[PDB]
Design a protein around this motif. Structure first.
Motif, PDB file in Angstrom:
ATOM      1  N   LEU A   1       0.811  -1.209   0.000  1.00  0.00           N
ATOM      2  CA  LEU A   1       0.000   0.000   0.000  1.00  0.00           C
ATOM      3  C   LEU A   1       0.845   1.261   0.000  1.00  0.00           C
ATOM      4  O   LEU A   1       0.544   2.206  -0.734  1.00  0.00           O
ATOM      5  CB  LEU A   1      -0.927   0.010   1.206  1.00  0.00           C
ATOM      6  N   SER A   2       1.902   1.274   0.812  1.00  0.00           N
ATOM      7  CA  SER A   2       2.782   2.450   0.912  1.00  0.00           C
ATOM      8  C   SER A   2       3.689   2.580  -0.296  1.00  0.00           C
ATOM      9  O   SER A   2       3.852   3.669  -0.839  1.00  0.00           O
ATOM     10  CB  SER A   2       3.660   2.390   2.166  1.00  0.00           C
TER      11      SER A   2
ATOM     12  N   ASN B   1       3.584   1.182  -3.416  1.00  0.00           N
ATOM     13  CA  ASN B   1       2.990   1.255  -4.728  1.00  0.00           C
ATOM     14  C   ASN B   1       2.189   2.535  -4.965  1.00  0.00           C
ATOM     15  O   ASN B   1       1.289   2.859  -4.198  1.00  0.00           O
ATOM     16  CB  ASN B   1       2.128   0.017  -4.952  1.00  0.00           C
ATOM     17  N   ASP B   2       2.486   3.228  -6.066  1.00  0.00           N
ATOM     18  CA  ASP B   2       1.802   4.473  -6.434  1.00  0.00           C
ATOM     19  C   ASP B   2       0.357   4.291  -6.900  1.00  0.00           C
ATOM     20  O   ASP B   2      -0.334   5.284  -7.204  1.00  0.00           O
ATOM     21  CB  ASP B   2       2.563   5.190  -7.545  1.00  0.00           C
TER      22      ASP B   2
ATOM     23  N   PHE C   1      -1.999   2.689  -5.189  1.00  0.00           N
ATOM     24  CA  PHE C   1      -2.880   2.851  -4.039  1.00  0.00           C
ATOM     25  C   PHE C   1      -2.494   4.151  -3.352  1.00  0.00           C
ATOM     26  O   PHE C   1      -1.324   4.349  -3.001  1.00  0.00           O
ATOM     27  CB  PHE C   1      -2.698   1.713  -3.042  1.00  0.00           C
TER      28      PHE C   1
ATOM     29  N   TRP D   1      -8.010   3.566   1.735  1.00  0.00           N
ATOM     30  CA  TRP D   1      -7.075   3.310   0.650  1.00  0.00           C
ATOM     31  C   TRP D   1      -7.896   3.105  -0.579  1.00  0.00           C
ATOM     32  O   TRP D   1      -8.893   2.375  -0.543  1.00  0.00           O
ATOM     33  CB  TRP D   1      -6.238   2.050   0.911  1.00  0.00           C
TER      34      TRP D   1
HETATM   35 MG   LIG Z   1       0.972   4.248  -2.122  1.00  0.00          MG
END
Ligand SMILES: [Mg+2]
Length: 102
Positions: free
Chosen positions: A55-56, A58-59, A61, A77
């Motif tokens: 989640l953090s 990857n652009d 999400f 998210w």
């Molecule tokens: Mg992200």
DNA sequence: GACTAAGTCAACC
DNA sequence: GGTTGACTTAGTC
């Protein structure tokens, strides 16, 4: 069981997309994955940290803050609208280029 | 087998 | 919880 044929990226994307609001909290991401893939009923502290990293990192999400408390605790998210249909048309394990921003 | 996306571990915030 | 990174693992062409 054996591991579902989807990456976490794919998993998180199916979880968001089916969301009535098209966005979930961490915990709701975990719950969907567990409700449907009994495999993920185990080894939780390993894959749940890997969901957080996804989640953090990857652009595709982006997080969406809550406002009026709602339930409260944990951001939402959602998927960057410029992600395309990425893990789409038969490739859930490896994306042919990860969505990086600019 | 390369090339690079994906997953792990783990500290810090 | 949300970021980072250094490093491993693994799909695909
Ligand atoms: Mg992200």
């Amino acid at each position: 069981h054996a591991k579902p044929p989807y990456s976490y990226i794919s998993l998180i994307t199916m979880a968001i997309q089916q969301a009535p609001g098209k966005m979930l909290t961490l915990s709701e991401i975990y719950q969907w994955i567990m409700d449907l893939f009994p495999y993920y009923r185990e080894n939780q502290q390993r894959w749940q940290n890997s969901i957080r990293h996804s989640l953090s990192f990857n652009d595709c999400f982006v997080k969406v803050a809550r406002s009026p408390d709602k339930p409260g605790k944990g951001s939402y998210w959602a998927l960057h609208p410029s992600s395309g249909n990425m893990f789409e048309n038969g490739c859930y394990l490896r994306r042919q280029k990860r969505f990086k921003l600019a």
